[model samples]
Target: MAKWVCKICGYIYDEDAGDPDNGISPGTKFEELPDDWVCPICGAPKSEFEKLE
Candidate 1:
């Protein structure tokens, strides 16, 4: 699944790619991220993320 609020507007997470830095490995879903996980870009919260499902 693809997710974004705009890369320049917020960080995008590719579940298929996995973010090793955050230990958020592949197959991760928006509903499954750690509670503290949020984008530092602009001011977009994880709540701002639209679901592909």
Candidate 2:
């Protein structure tokens, strides 16, 4: 799966390694994330993210 990178702070969200800091377990896809989930680094919302090449 393609990764999602935060445009606000350059936070990288990898599906293979979910964000445990925010309770997001491994294998969690970006599409499976909640609407309120923000960038753990910069507090940017999902809308502030773009697909990483």
Candidate 3:
């Protein structure tokens, strides 16, 4: 899967990195982001997501 780049802080979500929810598990595709998922670093919406090259 491609990395999900956070436009607000350039935080890229890498599924293999680590847990994103209190050590639950890393996040997946940007499109896989929940309807209510917000940027972990900046609280931006899904619309703020951008795919990395």
Candidate 4:
């Protein structure tokens, strides 16, 4: 699984280590995240994230 970076805040969402603050368990993929999931750091919408190379 790849990492996703928040374009607005540089917050990184790792599939191998999901955002626990948002109740997302580890190993959760970006595509599997809820549509309304936002950046934990900046509260940016999911649409503001892009897959990290």
Candidate 5:
């Protein structure tokens, strides 16, 4: 599995980030996000996601 890091607030979206009303399921992949999936914490676009090491 991969980890998604929010570039806006540095929030880590992991399996622990339970399902959100914004349509992001827990463990959702950064690459699989819909074109409209924005950050739940900061409303940043998918372009702000960065893969973790």
Candidate 6:
């Protein structure tokens, strides 16, 4: 699984360690996140996240 970073902020979203407390299940792939998912830190859109390659 790949990690995605919020461009508006510096929050890193990792599939293997998703924010379980934020309603995200651990091990949930970034690409598999809901289309309405927003940045937990900056309220940025999902499109604003870039793949942490």
Winner by TM-score: 4
What is the C-alpha lDDT profile of model 5 across 1-53, one tens digit per residue? 67778889997766445347767777766676788877788988878878788
Candidate 1 C-alpha lDDT tens digits along 1-53: 66544344645766665556666787776667787776644545577766544
Q: Quantify all predictions' global Cα lDDT against the true fold.
A: 0.62, 0.90, 0.67, 0.92, 0.74, 0.87
Candidate 5 regions off by >4 Å?
A: 15-18
- In order of listing, the candidates' clash counts read 0, 0, 0, 0, 0, 0
TM accuracy, model 4? 0.92
lDDT string, candidate 4, 1-53, tens digits: 78999999898999999988899999999999999899999999889999988
Q: Go through the candidates in order and give the C-alpha RMSD of each one to the true structure.
A: 3.1, 0.9, 2.5, 0.8, 2.1, 1.0
Candidate 6 residues 1-53, lDDT tens each?
77899988899999888878778998998878888888889889889999988
Q: Regarding lDDT, does 1 or 3 come out ahead?
A: 3
**Alpha carbon deviation, residue 53, candidate 3 (Å):** 2.5
lDDT of model 1, residue 1: 69
Instruction: Give the candidates in order of lDDT, highest first.
Output: 4, 2, 6, 5, 3, 1
Tell me each candidate's TM-score.
Answer: 0.58, 0.90, 0.69, 0.92, 0.71, 0.87
- lDDT, candidate 6, equals 0.87
Q: How much is the lDDT of residue 44 in candidate 5?
A: 88
Best-fitting candidate, measured by lDDT? 4
lDDT of 2 by residue, 1-53 (tens): 66999999888999888898898998999989988899999999999999887
What is the lDDT for 45 in model 1? 56
What candidate 1 gets wrong by more than 4 Å, as runs, is 6-10, 40-43
Error in Å for residue 2 of model 4? 1.0
lDDT preference between candidates 1 and 4, better one: 4
